[PDB]
Amino acid sequence: AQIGPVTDLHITNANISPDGFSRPAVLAGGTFPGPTIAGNTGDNFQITVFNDLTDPSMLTDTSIHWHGLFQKGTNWADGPAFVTQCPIITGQSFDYNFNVPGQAGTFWYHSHLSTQYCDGLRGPFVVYDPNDPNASLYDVDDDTTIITLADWYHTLAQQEPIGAAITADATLINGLGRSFTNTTASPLSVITVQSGKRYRMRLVSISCDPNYLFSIDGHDMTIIEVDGVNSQQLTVDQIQIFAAQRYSFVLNANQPVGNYWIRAQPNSGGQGFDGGINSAILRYEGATVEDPTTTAPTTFSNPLVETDLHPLADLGVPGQPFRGGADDPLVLNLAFANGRFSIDGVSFVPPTVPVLLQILSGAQNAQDLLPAGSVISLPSNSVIEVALPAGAAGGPHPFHLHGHNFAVVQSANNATPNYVNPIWRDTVSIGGTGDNVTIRFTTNNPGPWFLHCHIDWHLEAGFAIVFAEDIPDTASANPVPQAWSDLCPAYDQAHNI
Ligand SMILES: *[C@@H]1O[C@H](CO)[C@@H](O[C@@H]2O[C@H](CO)[C@@H](O)[C@H](O)[C@H]2NC(C)=O)[C@H](O)[C@H]1NC(C)=O
Ligand SMILES: *[C@@H]1O[C@H](CO)[C@@H](O[C@@H]2O[C@H](CO)[C@@H](O)[C@H](O)[C@H]2NC(C)=O)[C@H](O)[C@H]1NC(C)=O
Ligand SMILES: [Cu+2]
Ligand SMILES: [Cu+2]
Ligand SMILES: [Cu+2]
Ligand SMILES: [Cu+2]
Ligand SMILES: [F-]
């Protein structure tokens, strides 16, 4: 029941009750989470998105981002509203037609208009590798081995009141889970394994906000992939996974046939597992159909620490092995005050004309691009370093860069940089007060690429900038289809802009 790489995808409103509480939602493919979109490395994806939304309480416009896919030469297909496109209006469709050269791993897709993905438009996106270097480490890798972690809210995203704290009402694992308050014994998700087999579990955070402490009672987890990047095997017994991150891990079904709790503890909302909140079930074939009776340890023996991860391939780190050892070394001032986030003193407010369209129309430096102060040019064929010092309220903030992955030269909670063999990824926690999480990449992908906190409430409140990478080559690199050119006139007509 995976779809793609060539598929329609209808976006609709419907009622759902994933924790026993009914509310309307914004859904892809009629389900929460949406169906898995899948193909093989190098494939041409043609995802024709039909906007069938009618309920304005969750916005009737939409736009979909394919998280972690580089979109080289297809910046127009990336999805962030008012960065690479105007939204698709109701009753219309749009073909996101792109290729995935050189990428294979675990990704996801989500609305990228306002806070709409929180209302339900989120699902997995898997790019398989027929020649996966990790293939011999497991036996089973299919739709039954994808594990999604989601926050779920009873209040609609657009209806979250100004000036009140936002927390979720349930953790959903594979779309099911129990509410933190007024808990009812609604069904839990079951992940089934066969004793003796090995599984590539593809763990996807589709969170709008919380990070999760993920574990499986009785089991450990051997990480083999981080945000699309193959890793050396790293065995852990708990994974702290931030919004939008992905891991693959090998699960060896090497415990007695039985039932084991799967745990996903968010950093906000309900604490613990009373009544089966924050929980799913790992069930071995042949086990009794009953809840697990296992318990977590008080202290985990081998939690994931990001500096322990290393690429499988020899990826290195571009630039020179010291702070500022890049062609374009940046340090962003990330702040929060009075309900708004800012980067270098500017709070992001989406522009009327998408940044890509401004560039195609001839705006050719970043000072000419709107929003003023929110678009930073990057030079072509250059090593970029971005330091992201933490401290802004609401952390730890998982920062994400479109169009690229990056070397994590410095991770949370550790002052020592790594210029030799750090993991590469696309979404990174910037940590806690006094940290200096730092990323590096090379600019070989012309176009405007969003950089933002992936806590969607923080993005909405301005925690973003756009990197206009290689403005001079953006138009030649990214030819646009007529349907894309038609989006802004249709949107602006519909909205009387
Ligand atoms: C994080 O690292 C960056 C460099 O990657 C530091 O930036 C330097 O900041 C000082 C002022 O604080 C400037 O004088 C330098 O020109 C900056 N660049 C360098 C040294 O390469 C930044 O201070 C660090 N931030 C924290 C909070 O540790
Ligand atoms: C803090 O981060 C540093 C840098 O990533 C880690 O240092 C590396 O540690 C490994 C394992 O002992 C060594 O092989 C490397 O040579 C170290 N690199 C550097 C640049 O020092 C360090 O382990 C991390 N600290 C903790 C507590 O995990
Ligand atoms: Cu994303
Ligand atoms: Cu993205
Ligand atoms: Cu944030
Ligand atoms: Cu984004
Ligand atoms: F991305």
Residue type, 466: V
490: phi then psi, degrees, rounded to nearest 5: -65, -45
Residue 221 and residue 341 in one domain: no
Tokens found for residue 363: 């705006």
Pick the last residue of a domain from 133, 161, 182: 133
Evaluate the omega torsion of the peptide bond into residue 389 and state whether it is cis, within 30 degrees of 0: no
Residue type, 268: S
Distance (Å) of CA 93 to CA 63, 289, 483, 487: 10, 44, 9, 10
| Strand 424-425 with 406-410, pairing | antiparallel
In terms of residues, how long is the chain?
A: 497
Ligand index nearest the alpha carbon of residue 459: 5
Q: How far, in Å, is the centroid of ligand 6 from the Cα of 386?
A: 17
List the resolution, Å: 1.0
Place of tokens 């969170």: 207
The neighbour count for residue 42, using CB atoms within 10 Å, is 14
CATH of the domain at 323: 2.60.40.420
Residues contacting 403, CB < 8 A, separation 6+: 70, 71, 72, 75, 78, 445, 447, 449, 469
CB environment 123-160: b (16+ within 10 A), e (fewer) = bbbbbbeeebebeebbeebeeebbbbbbbbbeebbeee
Residue 263 and residue 339 in one domain: no
Using CA atoms, how far apart are residues 327 and 305, in angstroms rounded to an integer? Answer: 29
CA of 434, closest atom in ligand 1 = 27
SS3 letters across the chain: CCECCEEEEEEEEEEECCCCCCEEEEEECCECCCCCEEEECCCEEEEEEEECCCCHHHCCCECEEEECCCCCCCHHHCCCECCCECCECCCCEEEEEEECCCCCEEEEEEECCCCHHHHCCEEEEEEECCCCCCHHHCCECCHHHEEEEEEECCCCHHHCCCCCCCCCCEEEECCECCECCCCCCCCCCEEEECCCCEEEEEEEECCCCCCEEEEECCCCEEEEEECCEEEEEEEECEEEECCCCEEEEEEECCCCCCEEEEEEEECCCCCCCHHHCCEEEEEECCCCCCCCCCCCCCCCCCECCHHHCCECCCCCCCCCCCCCCCCEEEECCEEEECCEEEECCECCCCCCCCHHHHHHCCCCCHHHCCCCCCEEEECCCCEEEEECCCCCCCCCCEEEECCCCEEEEECCCCCCCCCCCCCEECEEECCCCCCCCEEEEECCCCEEEEEEECCHHHHHCCCEEEEEECHHHHHHHCCCCHHHHHHHHHHHHHCCC
- The residue contributing the CA closest to ligand 1 atom 6 is 331
> Measured at the alpha carbon of residue 126, what is the angle toward residues 77 and 79, in degrees to the nearest 5?
20
Using CA atoms, how far apart are residues 240 and 180, in angstroms rounded to an integer? Answer: 20
Q: How far is it between the farthest Cα atoms of the chain? A: 66
Using CA atoms, how far apart are residues 416 and 410, in angstroms rounded to an integer? Answer: 7
Q: How was this structure determined?
A: X-ray
Tokens found for residue 341: 């986030």
Residue 337 and residue 282 in one domain: no
Kindly list the protein residues that place their beta carbon closer than 5 angstroms to ligand 3, a single-atom ion.
67, 244
Name which of 419, 423, 436 is nearest 322 in CA terms: 419
- The residue contributing the CA closest to ligand 2 atom 23 is 307
Using CA atoms, how far apart are residues 417 and 324, in angstroms rounded to an integer? Answer: 12
- The residue contributing the CA closest to ligand 1 atom 1 is 436
Residue 234 and residue 340 in one domain: no
Give all strands of the β-sheet with 190-193 in edge-to-edge order: 190-193, 279-284, 259-266, 212-216, 239-241
Mutate to test the pocket of ligand 2, among 323, 413, 418, 419 (most ligand atoms within 8 A of CB): 418
Q: How far, in Å, is the centroid of ligand 1 from the Cα of 381?
A: 24
Mutate to test the pocket of ligand 1, among 331, 414, 440 (most ligand atoms within 8 A of CB): 331
Q: How far, in Å, is the centroid of ligand 5 from the Cα of 343?
A: 12
- CB contact at 8 A, 418 and 390: no
Residue 95 and residue 105 in one domain: yes
Distance (Å) of CA 227 to CA 129, 223, 385, 407, 447: 15, 11, 19, 12, 21
Residue 127 and residue 175 in one domain: no
- Residue 170 bridge partners (DSSP): 152, 179
CA of 324, closest atom in ligand 1 = 21
Residue type, 374: S
367: phi then psi, degrees, rounded to nearest 5: -60, -25
Q: How far, in Å, is the centroid of ligand 5 from the Cα of 121?
A: 20
Residue 174 and residue 298 in one domain: yes
Using CA atoms, how far apart are residues 79 and 429, in angstroms rounded to an integer? Answer: 23
Residue 117 and residue 151 in one domain: no
Q: How many domains does the chain have?
A: 3
Name which of 173, 168, 133 is nearest 149 in CA terms: 173
- CB contact at 8 A, 327 and 379: yes
Residue 156 and residue 244 in one domain: yes
Mutate to test the pocket of ligand 1, among 320, 323, 385 (most ligand atoms within 8 A of CB): 323
- The residue contributing the CA closest to ligand 1 atom 28 is 436
Residue 28 and residue 44 in one domain: yes
Residues framing ligand 2 (Cβ under 6 A): 305, 307, 414, 416, 418
Give the range of the structural domain holding residue 11, as residue numbers without chain letter. 1-133
Using CA atoms, how far apart are residues 237 and 152, in angstroms rounded to an integer? Answer: 25
Q: How far, in Å, is the centroid of ligand 7 from the Cα of 64?
A: 11
Using CA atoms, how far apart are residues 119 and 24, in angstroms rounded to an integer? Answer: 8
- The residue contributing the CA closest to ligand 1 atom 9 is 331
Ligand index nearest the alpha carbon of residue 452: 6
Using CA atoms, how far apart are residues 96 and 484, in angstroms rounded to an integer? Answer: 9
> Measured at the alpha carbon of residue 11, what is the angle toward residues 5 and 14, in degrees to the nearest 5?
135
Annotated binding site for Cu(2+): 65, 67, 110, 112, 397, 400, 402, 452-454, 458
Residue 488 and residue 364 in one domain: yes
Tokens found for residue 488: 């802004």
Residues contacting 232, CB < 8 A, separation 6+: 309, 310, 311, 312
Q: Indicate which residues carry an active-site annotation.
A: 65, 67, 110, 112, 397, 400, 402, 452-455, 458, 463
Pick the last residue of a domain from 79, 98, 133: 133
Q: How far, in Å, is the centroid of ligand 5 from the Cα of 295?
A: 32
- The residue contributing the CA closest to ligand 1 atom 22 is 331
Residues contacting 56, CB < 8 A, separation 6+: none
Mutate to test the pocket of ligand 2, among 414, 419, 436, 437 (most ligand atoms within 8 A of CB): 414
Residue 411 and residue 477 in one domain: yes
Pick the last residue of a domain from 313, 341, 375: 313
Residues framing ligand 1 (Cβ under 6 A): 323-324, 329, 331, 387, 389, 436, 438
Ligand index nearest the alpha carbon of residue 343: 5
Q: How far, in Å, is the centroid of ligand 1 from the Cα of 331?
A: 7
